[PDB]
Symmetry: C3
Subunit: 396 residues, 3 copies
Amino acid sequence: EDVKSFLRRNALLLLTVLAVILGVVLGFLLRPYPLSPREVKYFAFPGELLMRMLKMLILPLIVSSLITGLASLDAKASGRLGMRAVVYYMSTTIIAVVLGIILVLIIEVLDCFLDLARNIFPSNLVSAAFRSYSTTQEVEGMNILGLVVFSIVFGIALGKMGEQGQLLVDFFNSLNEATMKLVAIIMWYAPLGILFLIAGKIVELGMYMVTVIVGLVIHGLIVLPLIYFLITRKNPFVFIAGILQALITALGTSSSSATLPITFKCLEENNGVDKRITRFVLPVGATINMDGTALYEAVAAIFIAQVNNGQIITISITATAASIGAAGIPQAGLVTMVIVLTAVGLPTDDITLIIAVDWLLDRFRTMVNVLGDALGAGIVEHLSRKELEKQDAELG
Amino acid sequence: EDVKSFLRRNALLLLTVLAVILGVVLGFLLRPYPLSPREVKYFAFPGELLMRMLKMLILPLIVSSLITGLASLDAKASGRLGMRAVVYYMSTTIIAVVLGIILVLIIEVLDCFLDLARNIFPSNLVSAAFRSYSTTQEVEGMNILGLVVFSIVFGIALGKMGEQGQLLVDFFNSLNEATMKLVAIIMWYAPLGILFLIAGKIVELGMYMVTVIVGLVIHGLIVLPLIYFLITRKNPFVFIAGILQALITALGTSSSSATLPITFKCLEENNGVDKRITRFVLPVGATINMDGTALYEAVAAIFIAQVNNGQIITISITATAASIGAAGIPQAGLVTMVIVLTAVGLPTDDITLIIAVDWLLDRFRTMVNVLGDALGAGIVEHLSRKELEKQDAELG
Amino acid sequence: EDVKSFLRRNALLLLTVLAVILGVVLGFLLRPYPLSPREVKYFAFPGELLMRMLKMLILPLIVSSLITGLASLDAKASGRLGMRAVVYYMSTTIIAVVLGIILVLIIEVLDCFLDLARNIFPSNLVSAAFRSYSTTQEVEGMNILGLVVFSIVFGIALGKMGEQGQLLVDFFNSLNEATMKLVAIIMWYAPLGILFLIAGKIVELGMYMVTVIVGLVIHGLIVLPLIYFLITRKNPFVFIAGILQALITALGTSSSSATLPITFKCLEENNGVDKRITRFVLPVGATINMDGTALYEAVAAIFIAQVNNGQIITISITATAASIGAAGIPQAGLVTMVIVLTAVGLPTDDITLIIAVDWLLDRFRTMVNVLGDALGAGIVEHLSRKELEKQDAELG
Ligand SMILES: N[C@@H](CC(=O)O)C(=O)O
Ligand SMILES: N[C@@H](CC(=O)O)C(=O)O
Ligand SMILES: N[C@@H](CC(=O)O)C(=O)O
Ligand code: NA
Ligand code: NA
Ligand code: NA
């Protein structure tokens, strides 16, 4: 009887679920036909248009979110909110790497460190907005990390100054809300885009793919929800229902940085999470908090060691280190595996074998990477209760 | 007796007319001499300096004009102003294509649609400001269309929010006026630049060139002025005298997007047109309203059919479609002719024959493209009388 | 007895002096070892990280400084402050070229003028922030001159408008202070960076190197200090002690444009110089006022003439002209020597011989280039006394 009101209310959520169900059907139907690379690009195009729309809003989001996020909070309160986030991030990326290692047991690398260091401190801000550094020397594609860093320091700087800083805070606050109004339009195209984005990909190792997928279920649907209930004492699967549009889009894009604007609209609107805490937890979580990637890094390094064959402590240290370094971009998990392979001693040429089934694992690990930030905000919000209480009463 | 006051008042206008008269003389004098490509570039340089100055101001103009233009107007009033503009644009591009077809009778193409679609939704705003998409994949040169789209949606978003949006409206209003103060300095260099810009070009098919030029006179000096008198009931050749500096510069540059800042100063200062309506009509008209290009597209497709040899309805549909797609950049008419040739069935390799005389036709068709936007603003302003009456009295 | 308080107070200044002393020691110790180019890059990396941090802040500094600098001053007062600066700049670059010529006596070039002219008027502002023009055609690296020009005109434009302009002035004032708060963090990394930046360079003509170095001492420590005492009637070597951190960093970077944010913090904090005058004198001085380069240009053109062999007036005219054209970037002195060699008649291929010892002379000539701007601000501030008196009392 009550399923009619469920169809009327969850209309946009159900259309995106149907987009996955019908998108998988469409792809397998069109798969036997001539798989021409130019034709595959044309077929997947309605999914490419959604990707462009989402990519567009990440820069005015990341920048405006952290500048207001850190300036709208008290001096030490900004540090406390950050400490809570960092403590949460490093523990979750440690639980996933430990859970990942146990499961797999049952079933130019210096240039990487330098390029990362170079990107933390960009030589040009206008460049940083569309270019990243990759020594061969500046490859195309936004330097998210470099902008996240600069925005954090810039936010602190406006917080340091008085009413002079207030103008820019108000400027960046108006710019945040305006781009957030645009992600409402992006959300309506999402059912159409998600269909073609996943149909195109399913158009384009046995135990391994299983170990990772099952490993992500134990972490994502059993480990992380328990952490939320242990801190907030609220039902985590009702919270996951709010951010469900953000997970379905993370499956489609396979880029947590690309689905960041929808996770903002899901945490801010569908759930009762504060903007003052989502403006910090979500942009930082999108680039450093990667639980799904950390689990994948550990399993994939030991899976190649199952064929090639005590020092799993270095693997747990570097797989958690690779999870931080890795980009909120798709296929970033296989390129950062160079660090975890060279550390143990295994050859980096073995990534080639995994590359084939990587695409599908990437879609699921992105969903767990997003989920960690989403449940993260809810955890940090509840913990930073008095900080938000002091800021609300102050205005009165 | 009264010609002395005419020389004192119209000093800058007369210097730009003299720039064309003396510029044509200078070019034909220097034409027999060694036409070295490096030497031609050096000779035309004072014209290249004007081009850089004008190109510079288009980005802070297009962006600041539409953001304030759509936010400073009421919800449905913004839609009404737009409806009036769109109705005016599509009818004028239909009259020109019909007039063009009658006169000529008397005397990778999917990748184009995809690249256009890609550009309507840019993946990066900082990139969009100096790069356009052109699959082979991101060519240099501003994505005007992508910025016009985003600015329109961003304007609407600030209009949607209340007083929070007002700060950014005021910010973008100050930024519009400041760049408009700079186009006053650009206007003084214009007589010097226009001389060398046209002298250099005249230094660098019989019936065809005539059909187009005569076709643009019937449309520009007889069709469009009659439309203005039919709606406003005001003398159109006194209005054309106000925007006369913008037409002379359109002849020189051959880029309606480049002469957009001067058409703003001509419509806002020389004529009594409202900023609230020029901020929408002029930037949108510069990229989609191309009457001179639509007339050219129809004549050039049938001129090649006069040699190569019922279905002129597809030509009228795609030539009007090419007019929208075409860029406010020079030589954009010959590249968009691919769409109108493939639609009818004629070969795209026939554009090569036309390319020679194209340059001079481009200068005249740009003047008609600008004229359509200029007389367009005057037409839409007069029609949207009550909308501006309600906004003025509200402030009181 | 008083040396203990001298160590406590001048802690950051002494750490940067020690950075040079220990940096020269470190380099000569590591010099005999395999000098691999990839290894040299890795070794110098902590110096490369400082360079990125400093480069980062130049764009939001140059732009925000001149826009507020010229808008916060009266119409003719802006012209007077400028006249004082221009008169000071051209006389100092004339004294250095005269002093340089006397000492050396005792002991595609049109494309350069066009590229400079092109860069004074950039075709795109977003591009200008990370790209310069260099015909072969748009090379990577910020167009400082093009941004300095545009910012000056934009500042004047906000000054021209009333309270409408005030919002953007306040916006650019908040943006200036916020980036100036960031150069405090950059200053703490500077001792670590300066050590590796100079150690790496000392790891990588007899009379000539001496003539230039001795020539810079006569100008920098005898000519320029006397000018300050002659105008301000204040001790110049107490003023040099304030901007001493900016000189030590100019030695390290060899780029006056890169050390511009630290010279701002030195003149604004360590010395009692007004922001209203440093916001104009320092960014303009960084690109056009190059006393150390002008002295170098004259000596290097006549040193090649000492080997290869009345018309030294053209050398003094073009060496002062090259000093203006030259970039606040390292090794910009040898590339601009093409202008001064072609003018006299000497071959440009002779720059190859000088290139070897150029690096060390560049570090010293940058220190004199910075010093001229630093003592320049102090000279112009004292001269524009009443202008600042009228602006202060007005607010009361
Ligand atoms: N796709 C992941 C990163 C990766 O593991 O490739 C993300 O966007 O978070
Ligand atoms: N030159 C025209 C476009 C074209 O037809 O090439 C304009 O700028 O409007
Ligand atoms: N290095 C100098 C320029 C040069 O002479 O190379 C400066 O930055 O001012
Ligand atoms: Na990460
Ligand atoms: Na068009
Ligand atoms: Na200079």
